[PDB]
Amino acid sequence: STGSATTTPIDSLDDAYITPVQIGTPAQTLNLDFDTGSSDLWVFSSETTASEVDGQTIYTPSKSTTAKLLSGATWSISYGDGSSSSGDVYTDTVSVGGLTVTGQAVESAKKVSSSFTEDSTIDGLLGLAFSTLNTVSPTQQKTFFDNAKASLDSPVFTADLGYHAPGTYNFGFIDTTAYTGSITYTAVSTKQGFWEWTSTGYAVGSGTFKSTSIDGIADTGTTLLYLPATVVSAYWAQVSGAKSSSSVGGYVFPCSATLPSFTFGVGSARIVIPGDYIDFGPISTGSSSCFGGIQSSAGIGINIFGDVALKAAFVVFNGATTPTLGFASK
C-alpha cells in the first residue's frame, strides 16, 4: 500500500504545516502537525478541558464505532519549546492520504498548554520519530508509520515541504518526479529515538564550504534551523546590522536587509536554503526588526534541522531495518 497527503502551512510565515487525517468510523477529519521529532499521535478531543479548546476540531471517540478505550493507558509529553499535553488513549482506525491503519493509538488530550489552545489551526500532532519515544504508559504504543510499515510497498515516507506553499507527505513510495538530480542518503542514529544524522558542513552565501561534522535531527515539527553558535554567528555576520537580542530571544536583523543563502552538506551533496526562507518577518507588527530563521542550538542540547532546512529539500525517511535519510534538491 501507499498514502499521499498534502501538507499546508498554517500561516504566511510557514510556522508549521497541517495535514488532514481521518480518524474513526465514520471518519472524523482532523488537521494534524506531522512531527518527525516526536512519536505520539494526539488530538484535541471531547475530553479536553473546555477552557483549553479554542477553535480546534475535536475527536469524539463516542461517535466512532471503531474506537475502543485502551484501558488504563495514559500519556504525557513536553516538547522542546516547553509546550505540553496529556490524557488517555483510544485505539481507532486512522487514515492518511488513502493509507489506513487499524488499531492505531489515538491519544486523547485531557489537558493542553496555552500554546496549543492559542493555535486554532492545529488539532493535534502525528509523531513520526521512532516508537521508543512514545510516551504511552504502561504499554508503549507504535507510531502511525511503524504500524503501517510492513503493509507499505516500501518502508519509507517522504517530506516535501513547500516555501509559502503547500507540500506533500508520501508513505510507501518515492516520487521520482518530485525532486531534481539524485537523492543522497546518509546514515541515521536511532540511539536517542530521533532521525539523527551528521551533516558534512556548511557555506554562507557564495562563500567557501566549511567541512565540519554537525550532528542534528531532521525535525518537521520544528519551524527554524538551530545550529551551533559558531555557525550561526558566521551566518549573521554577513547581514549588516544583524545581532543576537536577549530580549527578543535570538538573532534579529533589519527588515531592509537582503539575506544570503545558507548551504548544508549531505555527504558530498549540497542543499541550498535561499535567503528568503530565512526571513520570519517583523518581531512585532510594524517593527523594522525582523526575526531570523537560523538560530543557535546552544541550550537546546541538540542541533535541529527544522522546516527552514527541510523545505529546501525532498527528504526521504527510510525506515528499513537500518534506517537512513535521503536529501535531494528540488
DSSP string across 133-202: G---BSS----HHHHHGGGSSSSEEEEE--SSS-EEEEES---TTSSSS-PEEEE-B-TTSS-EEEEEEE
**Reduced to 3 states, what is the DSSP secondary structure of residue 278?**
helix
- Residue 21 region, left (φ>0) first, then alpha (ψ -120 to 50), else beta? beta
- Contact between 112 and 58 (Cβ < 8 Å): no
Beta bridge partners of residue 282, listed in sequence order: 290
Residues 287, 162 share a domain: no
Q: CA nearest 164: which of 309, 262, 311?
A: 311
d(CA 295, CA 287): 20
Sign of dihedral through CA atoms 92, 39, 130, 304? positive
Residues 136, 210 share a domain: no
**Reduced to 3 states, what is the DSSP secondary structure of residue 85?**
strand
d(CA 40, CA 316): 20
Indicate the number of domains in the chain: 2
Residues 195, 167 share a domain: no
Q: Does residue 46 have an active-site annotation?
A: no
Residues 165, 32 share a domain: yes
C-alpha cell of 252? 534579529
C-alpha cell of 85? 499535553
Residues 231, 158 share a domain: no
Q: What distance lies between CA 81 and its chain's CA centroid?
A: 13
d(CA 172, CA 153): 5
- Domain end residue (candidates: 174, 204, 239): 174
What are the angstrom distances between the C-alpha of 222 and each of 37, 225, 244?
8, 8, 20
Rg (CA), the chain: 20
d(CA 26, CA 93): 10
Residues 204, 163 share a domain: no
d(CA 90, CA 33): 19
What is the identity of the amino acid at 77? I
Residues 328, 185 share a domain: yes
Residues 169, 212 share a domain: no
Q: CA nearest 272: which of 311, 223, 233, 326?
A: 311
Residues 134, 225 share a domain: no
d(CA 230, CA 300): 15
Output the domain CATH number for residue 314.
2.40.70.10
- Contact between 222 and 159 (Cβ < 8 Å): no
What are the angstrom distances between the C-alpha of 165 and each of 16, 205, 239, 266?
12, 24, 26, 25
What are the angstrom distances between the C-alpha of 36 and each of 81, 134, 292, 324?
15, 12, 23, 13
C-alpha cell of 178? 518530485
- At which residue does the C-alpha cell 542550538 appear? 297
What are the angstrom distances between the C-alpha of 37 and each of 33, 126, 127, 137, 196?
11, 10, 7, 19, 10
Residues 159, 181 share a domain: no
What are the angstrom distances between the C-alpha of 257 and each of 222, 286, 296, 307, 324?
25, 16, 20, 22, 38
d(CA 71, CA 139): 10
C-alpha cell of 311? 523545505
- Domain end residue (candidates: 174, 198, 214): 174
Residues 242, 129 share a domain: no
Catalytic-labelled residue, pool 35, 92, 119, 307:
35
d(CA 320, CA 145): 12
Asked, as a colleague might, if the bond just before 155 is cis with ω within 30 of 0, I would say no
Pairing mode, if any, of strands 243-245 and 289-292? unpaired
Burial class (CB in 10 A: 0-12, 13-18, 19+), 285: exposed
What are the angstrom distances between the C-alpha of 116 and each of 11, 164, 196?
15, 22, 26
Domain span at 222: 175-330
- Domain end residue (candidates: 110, 144, 174): 174
Q: CA nearest 241: which of 188, 175, 308, 292?
A: 292
Residues 156, 185 share a domain: no
Asked, as a colleague might, if the bond just before 260 is cis with ω within 30 of 0, I would say no
Q: What distance lies between CA 76 and its chain's CA centroid?
A: 19
Q: Does residue 154 have an active-site annotation?
A: no
Catalytic-labelled residue, pool 199, 261, 296, 297:
199
